Symmetry: C3
Subunit: 271 residues, 3 copies
């Protein structure tokens, strides 16, 4: 399916099944396909699942402008309005934790029943004056430098630390191939702009506006988004939030810990 | 090109050349690109060739519902009426033999000049009480179990027995790579639903409704769709049907026996 | 974005940034993505960049007809009119040098501010009676025979001489994988037809109609499109044309010499 955003950007999405809606927001480099197993799992169990390709990624258009969290959040708002969704459970992975949070902050939670943050960059990823524990911005500067030289090889190299293959996790060549194939669909511009967005956007104000049941899941083996300065803190800043830590799990735990995630999502919805 | 099915599913197709129409229906996991060599061959020789991506596959939309043979047949019906095709020759490979057969069963043969069944699941694939020689359903249950864990690697592993690489056939890395690339485009849900469809659908009633010239081609080295209980039987059940067995050919013989297939299709059309 | 050509073919394109427009025409097998780095470079420096997927390639439709330079040129004309572009700088790579040249020859240069020909087939690629120095046509006949057997492996094998990997150039597996992925999106028919097009089309008449500032860049290590009989001659035949030769550079120098190309394009725009 598609809808057209305010600025004319065509956004691809899937809308599967029937029942209370669960809307998924993918991470950097990937697209809606990253959720295929969670969507099938939940939609065969009484839920309606929706997942979009973020502007500049997957099967969506690749605008030069609007590659920032305020726009990402408004895109989600437009999708929700387009489908006229109510009592929706928002689920975000990695940088996608940011735009579902920013959606709530900018638009409120009248249409929202719950929030799930998976290995998310919330409440803040990069260093700030009062957050020296964050990731130094020159780390992300180097991401950009390498992406602007050879993004294809960057993505390929990213697989190892993403899935924790360098630390004993087992992930098939097939999954690594699919990851690279999907990532290559994306815009070079969007890919680099997203680094700026997730490196420097402060979601701490957002946390204070989240007034729905919230579940935070993170792997404490995460090499990409440090548990200690993200997931751990988000769970504290969001009133009433629940926290689940997957022991030694990597960043890409929707793959390595798929069954566990599926069951945790279902249990959250049934609460 | 695209058309929109009754339920809103956008279906991608290619319509090449001019002359009497030949409409191709692809097998599981693939898309219209599997036919590219037959299409170029025939359209360069005075025929119009049409090939669609089955709902849930390739460049087509990925609906949660309608992943069954009755719907597949009605999609074909819509395409045919869409283009107002007449004296069309239907060509189906593997599970695609099922939906062209079901099209004739459901809609009749007024627009149809002939039928070609290539390594097809017709008249019946999986076991039934009166068909113990069929493939045990637990084989297909296992397919689903593996697909719901890691479909990417399933596809990759499938290449070997599909093309008979494990049994003396030579297929390039390029072909194997393209096969995987195309298969990854598909929906996880459609991929799994199709297993249920081709595993359990009985086309024996369909065979009695086929009242047009028919050519059945099958490799007797087929590791995926057993010749003895499919093609061999279809050729007997369809009145006046012709049977050609490609010696030692694997399931994916459109690749391994391309030239022979091209020439046989042309000969059938010129009968 | 998309527009619809005269014959109904839907063409995909990207339109990034603002300012004086720069329109890119890609080479054989590739698509608009080959320009991603040049587009980001220039659009972050005050220019508007536009790149399309040629009919039959990338994300564009795959027509059976119209796979020839006159049609390619008219496609470009339609895009230029669609966006009402003025003072546009046309940039063509390999076979794409042909359709920007043919656009000017067919439509004039009223809307054109400049022309850049990168490793282009201009003014003539294959042999003619008065051009025995060109590439013998049996070389291209061989391309076609191999493509019509296994285009996937042809593309894979083409990577080496294309990027000069067989002669000391270093190119990542990622780049080679992305190259293959994009090429496989294309139509078999368009792919083969393009060989006929670039093999036999004479652009010498076109050279005389080019009345705008022109920059010709070519690698003198180019194993695909011979500098001595293409770029070298084009620079002489086009009045006022500037010539830059990248020492030992391969055909695919937008990859191997990306930074040098970026800077040369900017310098040309700033003259």
């Amino acid at each position: 399916s598609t809808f057209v955003a305010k600025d004319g950007t065509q956004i691809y999405f899937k809308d599967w099944g029937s029942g209370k809606p669960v809307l998924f927001s993918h991470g950097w480099l990937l697209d809606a396909d990253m959720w295929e197993y969670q969507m099938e799992y939940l939609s065969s169990r009484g839920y309606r699942t929706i997942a979009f390709d973020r502007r500049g990624f997957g099967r969506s258009d690749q605008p030069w402008t609007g590659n920032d969290y305020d726009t990402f959040a408004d895109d989600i708002a437009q999708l929700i309005e387009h489908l006229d969704l109510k009592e929706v459970t928002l689920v975000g992975f990695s940088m996608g934790g940011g735009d579902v949070a920013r959606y709530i902050a900018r638009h409120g939670s009248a249409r929202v029943a719950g929030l799930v943050l998976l290995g998310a960059v919330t409440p803040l990823f990069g260093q700030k004056p009062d957050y020296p524990q964050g990731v130094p911005l020159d780390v992300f500067a180097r991401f950009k430098t390498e992406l602007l030289k050879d993004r294809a090889q960057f993505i390929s190299d990213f697989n190892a630390p993403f899935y924790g293959i360098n630390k004993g996790q087992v992930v098939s060549q097939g999954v690594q191939t699919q990851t690279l194939q999907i990532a290559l669909l994306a815009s070079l511009k969007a890919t680099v702009d997203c680094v700026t967005a997730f490196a420097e956007t402060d979601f701490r104000p957002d946390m204070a506006k989240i007034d729905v049941p919230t579940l935070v899941i993170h792997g404490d083996g995460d090499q990409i988004v440090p548990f200690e300065t993200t997931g751990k803190v988000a769970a504290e800043l969001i009133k009433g939030a629940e926290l689940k830590v997957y022991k030694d799990a990597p960043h890409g735990f929707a793959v390595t810990h798929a069954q566990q995630l599926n069951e945790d999502l279902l249990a959250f919805l049934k609460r």
